Amino acid sequence: MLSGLNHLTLAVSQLAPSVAFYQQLLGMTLHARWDSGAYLSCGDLWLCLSLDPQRRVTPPEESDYTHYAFSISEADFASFAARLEAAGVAVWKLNRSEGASHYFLDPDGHKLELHVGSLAQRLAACREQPYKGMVFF
Amino acid sequence: MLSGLNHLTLAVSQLAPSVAFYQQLLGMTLHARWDSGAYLSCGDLWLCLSLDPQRRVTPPEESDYTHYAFSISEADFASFAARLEAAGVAVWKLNRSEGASHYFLDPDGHKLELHVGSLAQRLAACREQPYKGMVFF
Ligand SMILES: [Mn+2]
Ligand SMILES: [Mn+2]
């Protein structure tokens, strides 16, 4: 039986800017680094950055909607979004759904998000206003 | 401050086969589905499957090393991996370069992994058998 997400691994084209992004800009804890990768944590999340010559710096119009959302409190959301904006981090989408969300790109074009709100909160909102074709289990 | 992964969203090309893969084959909990997506959980993980016409079925030699690992216990690991193999689930990696792991593909070629062990356990193993150039903080 699967018990949760064990780790998220992102392929990166250049290790130093990716470590700077996740550790320094985004505030994650750097636990180890080696010639071809790094391990960081963000709360319970184990993040691995893996240096990969196959990684393309990918414009957001050229990748699909796969994305990785990090939790932040409502109280901290606006100042963190402003930090990303000050650093010139690109936005790939505007929020149109329940709960605050800020949609931003990493140095290689990985699609990231800051989101406020749980699955339970989303399901409660959906029960009141179901999406087209929505069924609950 | 960021506090962990709020959710993982995977773009999928065909919603029903992807829901079946995560729910039926991998045993995740299906909470809701609608015409364009589904919400599942795997322990604390919120997984969203999002129907995306841009998603392509991607062979593993065409994608980078970005991947998503799910936790499984030492007692359950081998029989779950063997069940996926017997069900014909495609693979993408054989060499265990980061401990006890099984590497497999979802229907669209998303790179998945079963892994036994925490970040702390992997750091302890790496102290004895470090990756080239490894430094611990
Ligand atoms: Mn999202
Ligand atoms: Mn892995």
From TrEMBL, chains A, B:
InterPro entries linked: Glyas_Bleomycin-R_OHBP_Dase, Glyas_Fos-R_dOase_dom, GlyoxalaseI/FosfomycinResist, VOC_core
Keywords assigned by UniProt, alphabetized: Metal-binding, Transferase
SUPFAM superfamilies reported for this sequence: Glyoxalase/Bleomycin resistance protein/Dihydroxybiphenyl dioxygenase
CDD domains hit by this protein: FosA
GO MF terms, alphabetically ordered: glutathione transferase activity; metal ion binding
Record-linked PROSITE patterns: VOC (PS51819)
Domain VOC: 4-117
UniProt: Mn(2+) binding residues: H7, H67, E113
Top-level lineage group: Bacteria
Enzyme class per UniProt: transferase
EC number(s) from the headed UniProt entry: 2.5.1.18
NCBIfam families: Fos_GSH, FosA, fosA5_fam
Official protein name in the record: FosA family fosfomycin resistance glutathione transferase
